[PDB]
């Protein structure tokens, strides 16, 4: 990074909102692709960057879905981009997910331009959007707050001409700083694991430069680049600070995002990469000692000790950190759920072994079973379930938890009976003659023996016998007989209370 | 592949003059030699039968300044060579370039002789030699080059080199600042106090 060379670049733009403002539609129409609703779920659960060539100059587009679950993706996408776009619908207005995107725009000090998505529907009006978002300091219009609004059809494909112009201008009015040659650096969009290609990452390069021989260092991972891939293009020789290019040949799957810096030699970068691992490992053992010692007692003070374990491996690195945060949101005091051994991709022997030791569900956002993986899963009793969307996953884990509960909320008496004129039996030691005043007496239902309102003894009936009949059930106001083991003293005037036991069941929330 | 620590601790632990402190002065006078090998060295000199076998090897290694792995090759080379195995051990060690540089009086000490040989200032038969473990054979002439000639390091060594034994197996010369290896040193000309039978034993088990 020497020479202080300043060259203009294509602005990187991210788009945020409440789900359903047709945020994806804006991109696909510009891209003339329409990959929307071609994928499972009908919505975009993943992040990607796509550069297009349109007058004037060059521009690239980045998009992140807006959901309660993706706390991290929208936070990282804002700070990386020079310009942020916020989609808003006149029918939808403002929503708590959209205001969440407002904070990401201001805290990242990134200038913002917006577009009205629906001009097609007659019940949709712009004035509603402007005024209601007026209250918030963001999105002023012609009040001297320099922000500009755009009205697009998004289905109609109507300009757009204005939105595009604003974006170009907004990037034009601010000085665009970059360099064509120098020390390469940037951030990682999304990383995942491939079977043939190996571990890969999608990287935005702040300073644009690359070469097959150049050594690159991402986080605590290091390595030489074997090949370069850009979008549909299978191979690219050179990559500029503007257009993003998937990086390949790194040692292992890096963090979901971080700062990446190339180096001259790999040997010099080996010690640095190992140094970052030591710190990350030291804090790992540090946070491990605290959480265990935090209770300051050998066990839990109450009965919440019952827990459920899960095993998760997702193909993409961006999800495992992001959805886990949303997976810890559904956690409750009663039933505690924890993730064990989050994977970078697929499935493996040591992963199936991990679920073998402790009973757990093995789930993946997207995964396929390995040849060696099937043998283990099919042999021992386990469960392999893969889910296209995170919503179907977040629901069933809760379901697993709700079932775990075992609550019986009813201890209603089945019958109440008073005993009189005790008889002697060899087997039980006593038979207390009874007369049921209320309800029906049953065999295996538990009883409460009490005298003078206090309980002298407790137990469960072993034998209910009237005469030589030995019937299993006795109604009220019918002469009845009773005996039980481990009850020594039968006195008249006391009353025995029999009660059935039932379980209400439980739900999670 | 060098010691670098205190040279007199090696002399003290053996309890014999290794000629590492020689240089300008000689014959110790002030010493503290033996007497406290360690902090509890004033304890009695009673020692095992196995330990005196190892103690001999350390004496020969600490004189010439050789490591156990490099020194393992000299027993292996001396054993395969004909005649007495003990006589061949010290003969191969006596044929080292650092030591032949030390015997002629170019270096004032054995470490200093390895020091000067490392810097490519010693030339055998005209050609320069870096390695101190270079094996010197009969009719080999060894000398200091024109660069760094007549320096106070080499000059002071050759001055006080006349006061030592003055070995017969090589010519001192020191007129034009050169030397010659006449023939292989005899058993009587070396060894005496250092025994070869004790060091040769240790490798058998």
């Amino acid at each position: 990074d020497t020479g202080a060379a300043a060259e203009p670049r294509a602005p990187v733009v991210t788009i945020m909102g409440h789900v359903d403002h047709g945020k994806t539609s804006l991109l696909d129409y510009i891209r003339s692709t329409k990959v929307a609703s071609g994928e499972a779920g009908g919505i975009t659960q993943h992040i990607g960057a796509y550069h297009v060539e349109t007058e004037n100059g060059m521009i690239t587009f980045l998009d992140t879905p807006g959901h309660a679950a993706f706390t991290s993706m929208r936070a990282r996408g804002a700070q990386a981009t020079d310009i942020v776009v916020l989609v808003v619908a006149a029918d939808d207005g403002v929503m708590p997910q959209t205001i969440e995107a407002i904070q990401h725009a201001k805290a990242a000090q990134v200038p913002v331009v917006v577009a009205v998505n629906k001009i097609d529907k007659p019940e949709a009006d712009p004035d509603r959007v402007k005024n209601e978002l007026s209250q918030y300091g963001i999105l002023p219009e012609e009040w001297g707050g320099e922000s500009q609004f755009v009205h697009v059809s998004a289905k109609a494909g109507t300009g757009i001409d204005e939105l595009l112009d604003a974006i170009l201008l907004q990037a034009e009015v601010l000085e665009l700083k970059a360099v064509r040659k120098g020390m390469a650096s940037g951030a990682v969009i999304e990383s995942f694991l491939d079977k043939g290609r190996g571990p890969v990452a999608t990287v935005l390069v702040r300073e644009g430069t690359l070469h097959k021989g150049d050594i690159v260092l991402c986080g605590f991972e290091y390595g030489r680049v074997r090949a370069m891939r850009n979008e549909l293009g299978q191979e690219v020789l050179e990559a500029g600070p503007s257009i993003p290019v998937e990086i390949l040949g790194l040692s292992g799957v890096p963090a979901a995002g971080d700062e990446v810096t190339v180096v001259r030699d790999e040997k010099k970068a080996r010690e640095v990469a190992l140094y970052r691992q030591g710190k990350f490992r030291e804090v790992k053992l540090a946070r491990q000692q605290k959480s265990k010692l935090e209770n300051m007692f050998a066990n839990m003070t109450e009965g919440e000790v019952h827990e459920v374990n899960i095993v998760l491996k997702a193909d993409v690195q961006g999800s495992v950190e992001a959805i886990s945060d949303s997976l810890l949101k559904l956690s409750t005091d009663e039933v505690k759920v924890k993730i064990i051994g989050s994977g970078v991709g697929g499935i493996t022997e040591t992963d199936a072994t991990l679920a073998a030791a402790s009973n757990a569900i093995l789930v993946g956002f997207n995964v396929r079973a390995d040849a060696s993986a099937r043998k283990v899963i099919e042999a021992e009793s386990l469960d392999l379930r893969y889910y296209s969307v995170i919503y179907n996953l977040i629901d069933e884990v809760k379901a697993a938890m709700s079932g775990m509960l075992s609550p019986e909320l009813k201890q209603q008496i089945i019958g109440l009976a008073e005993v009189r004129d005790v008889f002697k039996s060899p087997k039980f030691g006593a038979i207390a003659g009874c007369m049921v005043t209320e309800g029906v007496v049953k065999r295996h239902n538990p009883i409460r023996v009490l005298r003078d309102n206090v309980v002298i003894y407790e137990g469960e009936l072993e034998s209910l016998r009237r005469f030589k009949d030995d019937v299993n059930e006795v109604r009220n106001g019918m002469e009845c007989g009773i005996g039980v083991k481990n009850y020594n003293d039968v006195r008249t005037g006391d009353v025995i209370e029999v009660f059935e036991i039932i379980e209400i069941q439980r739900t999670i929330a | 592949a060098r010691y670098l620590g205190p040279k007199l601790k090696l002399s003290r632990r053996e309890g014999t003059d290794l000629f590492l402190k020689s240089g300008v002065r000689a014959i110790d006078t002030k010493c503290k030699i033996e007497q406290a090998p360690g902090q509890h060295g004033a304890r009695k000199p009673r020692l095992s039968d196995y330990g005196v076998q190892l103690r001999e090897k350390q004496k020969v290694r600490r004189i010439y300044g050789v490591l156990e792995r490099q020194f393992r090759n000299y027993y292996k080379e001396a054993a395969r060579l004909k005649g007495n195995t003990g006589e061949n051990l010290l003969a191969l060690l006596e044929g080292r370039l650092d030591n032949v540089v030390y015997r002629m009086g170019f270096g004032a000490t054995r470490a200093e002789a390895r020091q000067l040989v490392s810097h490519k200032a010693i030339m055998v038969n005209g050609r320069v030699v870096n390695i101190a473990s270079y094996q010197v054979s009969p009719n080999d002439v060894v000398s200091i080059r024109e660069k760094a000639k007549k320096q106070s390091r080499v000059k002071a060594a050759l001055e006080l080199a006349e006061q030592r034994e003055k070995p017969t197996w090589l010519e001192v010369d020191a007129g034009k600042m050169e030397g010659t290896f006449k023939r292989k040193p005899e058993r009587s000309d070396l060894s005496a106090d250092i025994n070869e039978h004790l060091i040769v034993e240790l490798y058998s088990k």
């Binding site: 053992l285 000692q289 051994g341 991990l354 | -």
Partner: protein, 62 residues
């Protein structure tokens, strides 16, 4: 198979797969192995100075 944990104290339990060096020392009947310290997820011995090679203790900055 059962395995001995060397050193004073440990953070090992339940999950987090550990390395096992092996070798037999006889004290608790049945033990034929030893766990490795400072390998994979296993912590080394804290506040140890002599014998750092054993028990996975790193050299402190002096």
């Amino acid at each position: 198979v059962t395995s001995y944990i060397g050193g004073e104290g440990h953070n090992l339990q339940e999950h987090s797969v550990i390395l096992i060096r092996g070798g037999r020392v006889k004290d608790l009947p049945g033990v034929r192995y030893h766990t490795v310290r400072g390998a994979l997820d296993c912590s080394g011995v804290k506040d140890r100075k002599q014998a750092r090679s054993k028990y996975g203790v790193k050299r402190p900055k002096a």
